[PDB]
C-alpha cells in the first residue's frame, strides 16, 4: 500500500490539499484527506468583531460564491433582530444570488475539466465570468469580495443601468453554456472519465450530510430554496435539476442545468423587481443615508453609534441555511445582547463533502481521485474556515 | 418543480450508433466548436495601452482628501479606526495650534487593509476615500505601510478623479 | 470582401506616419490600429478612441518617451497615464 | 484576429521546405545534374561502379555511343 501525499501544491488539487493516499497499484486503497492548510481563524476572529465588520469575513469563507454566503449571515442577523429587508433588496439578493450561482458553476464545471485535461471550456466561460464580475464591481465596487449584501438589505441601490446589462448578458449566456455541452456533455471521453465514478447511494448521501447537488444528483429531491424559501425565491418559478444514476457525469449535468435554471430566475428578477428602498428604514439596524446624517442630529447619532459600536442584536441563537451554490451554507450565530457575536459556526457545504471522498473513491485510480475532488466543488476556504 | 437531467435496436438505430462509435462523430463535433472560435475576435486588451473598465465605486487605493480651501478634511473623530475590520488605520490626534482638531499621525497599513470600503462609508466629513488607482505595487514591504503624508499626497494627486467619482455616486449613498 | 480586409490592413500600416513611425508603434505595443486622437496630455501621452472596436479595446493610450525624463520609450508603465485621463482610459467616465 | 498565427507558421513552413528542396539540389549538383543513383540492389551498384571505371573516376560522367 504505497503512501503518497497528493501534495498541497498540486496543479489539479484545488487550492492546497494534502490527500495522503495509499495506492495499491494505481488503485487508491485509502483516502485520508488532510485539512486546515487554510484554517485562518475565521470563527474566532468574528467573536472579536462587530456584526457589520464581520460581514466581510463571510465573502472570504467561500469566495467563488462571494455573495450567496453574505446572504446567509444577513438572513441570520435579520432573524435575530426580527427585521426583514425591504422588497427591492430582497429581489436584488435573489438577482445577485443567482448570478453568483452561475459564477460558482462556471468555476466548478470548467475547473473540473482543467484537472480532467480539457482546457478550452475554462477560457470560454472565464470570459463570461469576467463580464459578470463587472456587474459586481459596478454594484459593489469590488470585482469579488463586494460586501454588498449587508445584514439589513443591500448597501446601495443598483447603478442606473445595470439591470439592462444583466439582461444583455443573460440573453446570450445560454449559447455559451450550449457551446461547452457540445464539447463535454457528450464527448466520447468526458463521459468515460466521469460516468460511474464516485456513485453515492441516496441513503448514504443523507447519512454523510452531503446536502447539495451531491444529494440532488443521487435523486433525493431537496432544494432548500423550494423547501424552505428564503428572501423572495418563493415568488420566482424554477425547476430543481434532480438526477438519477448519481455519478460524476450525472451531477455535472445537474450543475449545467442549474446554470440554465438560474438564467430563468435572473430573467424574472429583471422582469419583476419593485421600486422601493434597498435597506431597512430602522436607523437602529441600517446606517442612515449620508444626506440625512449631515443634516439631522438623530441621523448623525445613529450613524456614529452604528459604525463605532453596532447593531446590539437581541440575545438568542439561530441556524439559518440557504442554498449556496456548493450546497447548504448555514451560520449558527449565538448572540449575547452585545454588538459583537458570541459564536458563529459556519456550516460549510464541503466539510461534509470532503469527508465523503473516502466513501466515494474506493478501489479507484489516481485519476479518479482528481475527478471526484472536482465533483464536490471543494473550496478550501469554506472547509478550513 | 423538479427535472430529470439524465433519466434516459432497429438496424438504423444500431447502425447509426456504430457510425458514431467507429467514425468518432461526437469527437469531430467538438473539433468544429473550437475551429469556430479560432475565427472569433479574441477578447484580450493591451494591458498598458487599454485598461479594463472600473466604474466610480471601485475601491482601489486609500487617499485622504482636503477642503478646496486647503484644510485637510479629517477632523480625527477616529471612527474610521473603529469600523476598520482589519485594525489597519492607526490614528492619534492633538489640538493643532489653530485650536482645531487634526490627526498628528494617520497610518493605513495597506498590507493589513482588505479594501472593504467601510472607512469610505464611516467618515462623517468623508476625508478618507477609496481612490480609483489599483496600481500601487511596491518593491519593499515598508512602502506599502502609508503615513498621513503619503495618503495626503495620494489625495492631492487623485483629487480631481476622486471628486468626479464621489460626484457620480453620492446620490446613491 | 477580403480585398477590403487587405485595404484596411494597408491603411493601418500607412496610418502610423512613415515606415519608421509604425515600426515604433509596432515594437512598443505590438498592435497596429488607427483611431481619432481624443487628446494629448501635458506629460507626453496620446489618447485614441475607436467606437467600432469592442468595449475592452475601444480606448487606448500610446505612451510617450521621457514623460518625466525616464527613458520610458521601452519600459512602458501603467501609472504613467495622468490621474485626470486615468478614468477616461478605464471607462469610469465617458467624457474626455 | 486569427490573421496573426500565420507569421509563425510562415517561418515553420519555410523551414520545412528548405530541407526537401536543399537535399534535392545538393544531390543534383554533386552528381552532375543527374539524380544520385539509388543502388538498392547490388546489380545497381555494379552498374554504377562499372560506370566509374568507364570514365574519370566518377560515375556521373557518362560516356555515350561516341566512345
Amino acid at each position: 500500500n504505497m503512501t503518497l501525499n497528493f501534495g498541497p501544491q498540486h496543479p489539479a488539487a484545488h487550492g492546497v490539499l494534502r490527500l495522503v493516499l495509499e495506492l495499491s497499484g494505481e488503485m487508491v486503497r485509502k483516502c485520508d484527506p488532510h485539512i486546515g492548510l487554510l484554517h485562518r481563524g475565521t470563527e474566532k476572529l468574528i467573536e472579536y468583531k462587530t456584526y457589520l465588520q464581520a460581514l466581510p469575513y463571510f465573502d472570504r469563507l467561500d469566495y467563488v460564491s462571494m455573495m450567496c454566503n453574505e446572504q446567509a449571515y444577513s438572513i441570520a442577523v435579520e432573524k435575530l433582530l426580527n427585521i426583514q429587508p425591504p422588497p427591492r433588496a430582497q429581489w436584488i439578493r435573489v438577482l445577485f444570488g443567482e448570478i453568483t450561482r452561475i459564477l460558482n458553476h462556471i468555476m466548478a464545471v470548467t475547473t473540473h475539466a482543467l484537472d480532467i485535461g480539457a482546457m478550452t471550456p475554462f477560457f470560454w466561460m472565464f470570459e463570461e465570468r469576467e463580464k459578470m464580475f463587472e456587474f459586481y464591481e459596478r454594484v459593489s465596487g469590488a470585482r469579488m469580495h463586494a460586501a454588498y449584501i449587508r445584514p439589513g438589505g443591500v448597501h446601495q441601490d443598483l447603478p442606473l443601468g445595470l439591470l439592462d446589462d444583466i439582461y444583455e448578458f443573460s440573453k446570450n449566456f445560454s449559447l455559451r453554456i450550449d457551446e461547452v455541452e457540445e464539447m463535454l456533455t457528450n464527448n466520447r471521453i468526458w463521459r468515460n472519465r466521469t460516468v460511474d465514478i464516485g456513485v453515492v447511494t441516496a441513503e448514504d448521501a443523507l447519512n454523510y450530510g452531503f446536502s447539495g447537488v451531491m444529494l440532488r444528483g443521487s435523486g433525493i429531491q431537496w432544494d432548500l430554496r423550494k423547501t424552505q424559501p428564503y428572501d423572495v425565491y418563493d415568488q420566482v418559478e424554477f425547476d430543481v435539476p434532480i438526477g438519477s444514476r448519481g455519478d460524476c457525469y450525472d451531477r455535472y449535468l445537474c450543475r449545467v442545468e442549474e446554470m440554465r435554471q438560474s438564467l430563468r430566475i435572473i430573467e424574472q428578477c429583471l422582469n419583476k423587481m419593485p421600486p422601493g428602498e434597498i435597506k431597512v428604514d430602522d436607523a437602529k439596524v441600517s446606517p442612515p443615508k449620508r444626506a440625512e446624517m449631515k443634516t439631522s442630529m438623530e441621523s448623525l447619532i445613529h450613524h456614529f453609534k452604528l459604525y463605532t459600536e453596532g447593531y446590539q442584536v437581541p440575545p438568542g441563537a439561530t441556524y439559518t441555511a440557504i442554498e449556496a451554490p456548493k450546497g447548504e451554507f448555514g451560520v449558527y450565530l449565538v448572540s449575547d445582547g452585545s454588538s459583537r457575536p458570541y459564536r458563529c459556526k459556519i456550516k460549510a457545504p464541503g466539510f461534509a463533502h470532503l469527508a465523503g471522498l473516502d466513501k466515494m473513491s474506493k478501489g479507484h485510480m489516481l485519476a479518479d481521485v482528481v475527478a471526484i475532488i472536482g465533483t464536490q466543488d471543494i473550496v478550501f476556504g469554506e472547509i478550513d474556515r | 418543480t423538479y427535472k430529470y437531467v439524465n433519466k434516459k435496436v432497429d438496424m438504423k438505430s444500431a447502425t447509426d450508433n456504430a457510425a458514431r462509435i467507429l467514425m468518432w462523430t461526437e469527437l469531430i463535433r467538438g473539433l468544429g466548436m473550437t475551429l469556430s472560435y479560432l475565427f472569433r475576435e479574441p477578447a484580450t486588451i493591451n494591458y498598458p495601452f487599454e485598461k479594463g473598465p472600473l466604474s466610480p465605486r471601485f475601491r482601489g487605493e486609500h487617499a485622504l482628501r482636503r477642503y478646496p480651501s486647503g484644510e485637510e478634511r479629517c477632523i480625527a473623530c477616529k471612527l474610521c479606526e473603529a469600523i476598520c475590520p482589519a485594525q489597519a488605520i492607526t490614528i492619534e490626534a492633538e489640538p493643532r495650534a489653530d485650536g482645531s482638531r487634526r490627526t498628528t499621525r494617520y497610518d493605513i497599513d495597506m498590507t493589513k487593509c482588505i479594501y472593504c470600503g467601510f472607512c469610505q462609508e464611516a467618515c462623517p466629513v468623508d476625508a478618507i476615500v477609496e481612490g480609483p488607482n489599483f496600481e500601487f505595487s511596491t518593491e519593499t514591504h515598508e512602502e506599502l505601510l502609508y503615513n498621513k503624508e503619503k495618503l495626503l499626497n495620494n489625495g492631492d494627486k487623485w483629487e480631481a478623479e476622486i471628486a468626479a467619482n464621489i460626484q457620480a455616486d453620492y446620490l446613491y449613498r | 470582401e477580403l480585398v477590403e480586409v487587405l485595404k484596411r490592413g494597408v491603411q493601418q500600416v500607412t496610418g502610423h506616419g512613415g515606415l519608421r513611425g509604425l515600426l515604433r508603434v509596432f515594437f512598443r505595443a505590438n498592435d497596429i490600429r488607427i483611431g481619432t486622437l481624443v487628446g494629448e496630455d501635458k506629460y507626453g501621452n496620446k489618447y485614441y478612441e475607436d467606437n467600432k472596436q469592442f468595449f475592452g479595446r475601444h480606448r487606448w493610450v500610446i505612451y510617450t518617451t521621457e514623460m518625466n525624463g525616464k527613458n520610458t520609450f521601452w519600459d512602458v508603465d501603467g501609472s504613467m497615464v495622468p490621474p485626470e485621463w486615468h478614468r477616461w482610459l478605464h471607462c469610469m467616465t465617458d467624457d474626455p | 484576429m486569427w490573421f496573426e498565427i500565420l507569421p509563425g507558421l510562415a517561418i515553420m513552413g519555410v523551414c520545412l521546405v528548405i530541407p526537401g528542396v536543399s537535399t534535392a539540389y545538393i544531390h543534383k549538383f554533386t552528381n552532375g545534374g543527374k539524380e544520385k543513383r539509388v543502388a538498392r540492389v547490388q546489380y545497381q551498384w555494379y552498374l554504377m561502379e562499372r560506370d566509374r571505371r568507364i570514365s574519370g573516376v566518377n560515375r556521373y560522367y557518362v560516356s555515350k555511343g561516341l566512345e
Partner: peptide, 28 residues
C-alpha cells in the same frame, strides 16, 4: 465581429448555430 461573411459562415457551419446573434464581443 468583422466576420467578413466567409469566416462567419465557416464559424456558423462548424458550430452548427448562429453565433452572430449571441456574440462574444459586447457592443454599445
Amino acid at each position: 465581429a468583422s466576420a467578413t461573411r466567409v469566416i462567419q459562415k465557416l464559424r456558423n457551419w462548424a458550430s452548427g448555430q448562429d453565433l452572430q446573434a449571441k456574440l462574444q464581443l459586447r457592443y454599445q
